[PDB]
Amino acid sequence: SRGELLLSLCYNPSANSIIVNIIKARNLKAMDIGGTSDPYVKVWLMYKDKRVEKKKTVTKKRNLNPIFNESFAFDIPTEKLRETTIIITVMDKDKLSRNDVIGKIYLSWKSGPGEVKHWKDMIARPRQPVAQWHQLKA
Ligand SMILES: O=P(O)(O)O[C@H]1[C@H](OP(=O)(O)O)[C@@H](OP(=O)(O)O)[C@H](OP(=O)(O)O)[C@@H](OP(=O)(O)O)[C@H]1OP(=O)(O)O
Ligand SMILES: O=P(O)(O)O[C@H]1[C@H](OP(=O)(O)O)[C@@H](OP(=O)(O)O)[C@H](OP(=O)(O)O)[C@@H](OP(=O)(O)O)[C@H]1OP(=O)(O)O
């Protein structure tokens, strides 16, 4: 409806890290009818309701199927995994006004069905990049 984003999660428990690989998106929704978009992807590491880190891909001008292939590493100790949320947002860069939200993804053990599945797959396959498509929720 708003597009899909393909990303992988790799949780290395001995290293206490989660690597987030923003791979690509497809069928992004444009602002106008028949127009284009300038998508970039934001990644926030959350602990409870507090932001721990923020990351950001480069922008892909005039591209509704952007390829990013960017990886971000986050430190997460075991005692905070249960309170961890990774929020991924596909944005639409606008030089004139405020950048619009295309879709958001909340990754944790207590999120939507597709998000919980991806999270559990990450937990169950430590040290493997688990990749999965996600519908973008407005
Ligand atoms: O000025 P922009 O290129 O549009 O980006 C800003 C900028 O983020 P970056 O500087 O990390 O690129 C803000 O951060 P500051 O420079 O003030 O530190 C950030 O604000 P917060 O990180 O404090 O949230 C804001 O994001 P927000 O939408 O949450 O206000 C974000 O704007 P975009 O996400 O729309 O690009
Ligand atoms: O949804 P996925 O499993 O990730 O695979 C898709 C899918 O490929 P298959 O349908 O053969 O699995 C697309 O195919 P169509 O829906 O068009 O039939 C294809 O798109 P194109 O063949 O039209 O190129 C795309 O390839 P790409 O994203 O490189 O354009 C490819 O993505 P994967 O690279 O993830 O296989």
Swiss-Prot record:
GO terms for biological process: calcium ion regulated lysosome exocytosis; calcium ion-regulated exocytosis of neurotransmitter; calcium-dependent activation of synaptic vesicle fusion; phagocytosis; phagosome-lysosome fusion; plasma membrane repair; regulation of bone remodeling; regulation of calcium ion-dependent exocytosis. Ca(2+) 6 binds at residues 94, 97, 100. Keywords: Calcium, Calmodulin-binding, Cell membrane, Cell projection, Cytoplasmic vesicle, Exocytosis, Lipoprotein, Lysosome, Membrane, Metal-binding, Methylation, Palmitate, Peroxisome, Phosphoprotein, Repeat, Synapse, Transmembrane, Transmembrane helix. GO terms for molecular function: calcium-dependent phospholipid binding; calmodulin binding; metal ion binding; phosphatidylinositol-4,5-bisphosphate binding; phosphatidylserine binding; SNARE binding. One of its GO terms (cellular component) is GABA-ergic synapse. Its main location: membrane. Disruption phenotype: No visible phenotype. Mice were born at the expected Mendelian ratio and do not show gross abnormalities and/or obvious neurological defects. Mice have a normal life span and are fertile, although reproductive capacity is declining faster with age. Embryonic fibroblasts from Syt7 deficient mice are less susceptible to Trypanosoma cruzi invasion, and display impaired lysosomal exocytosis and resealing after wounding. The keyword Cell membrane applies. Ca(2+) 5 binds at residues 32, 92, 94. Palmitoylated at its vesicular N-terminus; palmitoylation is required for localization to lysosome and phagocytosis in macrophages. The keyword Calcium applies. Residues 1-134 form the C2 domain. Ca(2+) sensor involved in Ca(2+)-dependent exocytosis of secretory and synaptic vesicles through Ca(2+) and phospholipid binding to the C2 domain. Ca(2+) induces binding of the C2-domains to phospholipid membranes and to assembled SNARE-complexes; both actions contribute to triggering exocytosis. SYT7 binds Ca(2+) with high affinity and slow kinetics compared to other synaptotagmins. Involved in Ca(2+)-triggered lysosomal exocytosis, a major component of the plasma membrane repair. Homodimer. Can also form heterodimers with SYT6, SYT9 and SYT10. Interacts with calmodulin (CALM1, CALM2 or CALM3). Interacts with CD63; required for localization to lysosomes. Interacts with APP. Belongs to the synaptotagmin family. This is Synaptotagmin-7. It comes from Mus musculus. The chain holds residues 266 to 403 of 403 of the full protein.
